[PDB]
Amino acid sequence: ALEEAPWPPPEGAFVGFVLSRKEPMWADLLALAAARGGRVHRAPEPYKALRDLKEARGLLAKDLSVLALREGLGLPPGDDPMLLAYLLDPSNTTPEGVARRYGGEWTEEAGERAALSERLFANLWGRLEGEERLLWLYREVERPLSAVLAHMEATGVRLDVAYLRALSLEVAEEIARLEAEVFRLAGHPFNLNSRDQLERVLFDELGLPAIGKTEKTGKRSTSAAVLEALREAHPIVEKILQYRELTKLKSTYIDPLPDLIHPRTGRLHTRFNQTATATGRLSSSDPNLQNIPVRTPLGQRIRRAFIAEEGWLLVALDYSQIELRVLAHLSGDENLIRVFQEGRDIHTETASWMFGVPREAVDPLMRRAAKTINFGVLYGMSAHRLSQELAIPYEEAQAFIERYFQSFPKVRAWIEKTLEEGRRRGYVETLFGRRRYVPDLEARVKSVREAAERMAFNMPVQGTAADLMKLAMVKLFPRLEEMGARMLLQVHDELVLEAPKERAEAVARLAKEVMEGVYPLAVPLEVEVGIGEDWLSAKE
């Protein structure tokens, strides 16, 4: 409907657009349109009509702003109805769902998408009248952030391609050595990547005992948790775990990332998805740069392929024990506050208990293990499972979990307060009022209910940490531009910046402090910073 009016559109219209593909840095702009009033404007030529707009306002605004930066046009994103819906309910994650929940249909034509962004904005902005805290998250965090992420997306990161090509051939020859040493240990060749075939070999032809089953189809599981408990029980299980790590890293990172360098930028560009998680975290895709390996030695080799441009340095900043400090603030547990008001490290302490060694002896491989253990226990891992992780008695793990929550008694009072409040209001909230609707808290099936409970009390603390990080990013981005530095990646509690060599020390010291004082809590936020030519040695 509306009324075809001649392009250009008046100021502050709502833009709709169609891309050749979902990735803004790689897409052709097929159609461009705008609407304000009862008028829909359609562009004769989309790439020239981008010159006319002063701001991107509408569904998926960040995406068009990214494509604009790719053509050297500073066109910042503004209002996006997706961002309002996502603050109303974080299950509002795609425009198909949002339009089919607030009064329209998400089609494939720019004009119709423009007019939809106009009405979708009116509706949701009305639904947020009086939700002053969500209106605060919108004006102060989420809408500014979409601009920051647009500049991150369009900048990209430099990758050592020749090095990854070379690493590919090396890993390939090693995969072949393990494959053959499994085909032999099994008396024949089969597809080692087919989990079904491997099931028959491990559990039928050989004699190994099936520890567990898969969720949907009830097959015998060949997961690492299962195979780890079948080590020494046969050497072939050890080789399969080696083969699995290598083909994972090769087919997910080593091989596809080099072929994704952009021809204009010479760099690698991810997408930061702003309305994609239930807790408020960002996500990253196409490629996901938030899960580049690091823990294993081959993984470290891959993390080193992410490097600074000629004449710059990477600066890496990572909040320490972030969800535990948030937890101390949220609960008000005094003993836990006192841990951080005294610079204690709960991952290195759990690691010394867990390995026997003195605190001065825990090395990175050990601390990493205690991180997963501590966060495992915190969010409700069963005694029985912990006893299988730590290889201890069951009543020994019950005490580890009773000692853990006894040294900080006020936490369980907060878990319970959080749950009871969620049953009454239907949602739980972070420190700034970001909310997750958790309807299954009154479920009558125990398993469905207790899962709802674990998602329910995790969200306030993980979404508070993500709120801090996002706010730090909007406070830091303007200061980095003064110094001529840039933001590259965010990995949940961590930032990577690129800075000129003769300014790196300055941007590190600065960025460290903006992050630490983003929002004073009842506990000091520490940050670790490092500088290097590559992502790995930046992280000290």
Next chain:
DNA sequence: GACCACGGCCAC
């Protein structure tokens, strides 16, 4: 070619 479900596994 394009989707999809599933088990599996990388990061935080």
Next chain:
DNA sequence: AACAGTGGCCGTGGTC
């Protein structure tokens, strides 16, 4: 595998 939570991508095995 499971009474830890949050993501996204892979190959396999299908269907259309």
